């Protein structure tokens, strides 16, 4: 937004490894960076096991 890359986060227990926890989330901002560069694509970066 307006040049800022923002990251919000939260942690919730998992009943199913392959699915989501139920109930409402309410994530809070941690990172807000004034870069001025657009994102059109997202790639998850994985670590190798």
């Amino acid at each position: 937004i307006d040049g800022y890359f923002k990251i919000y986060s939260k942690h919730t227990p998992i009943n199913l490894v392959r699915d989501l926890p139920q109930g409402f989330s309410a994530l809070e901002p941690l990172v807000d960076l004034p870069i001025g560069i657009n994102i059109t694509r997202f790639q998850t970066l994985l670590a190798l096991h």
Binding site: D2, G3, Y4, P34, G36
Partner: protein
């Protein structure tokens, strides 16, 4: 292409070295990131401020 300056302690003032620093301010339709802190005051309670 390059030629050195004879910066000697015996030169008159016009030929003495001067350190030049230019602070250029870039104001774009982008987030601002270099701000003055302005001056602070102390907190006053129970008065109109």
């Amino acid at each position: 292409p390059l030629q050195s300056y004879g910066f000697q302690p015996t030169n008159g003032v016009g030929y003495q070295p001067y350190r030049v620093v230019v602070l250029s301010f870039e104001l774009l339709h982008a987030p601002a990131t270099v701000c003055g802190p302005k001056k602070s005051t102390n907190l006053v309670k129970n008065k109109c401020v």
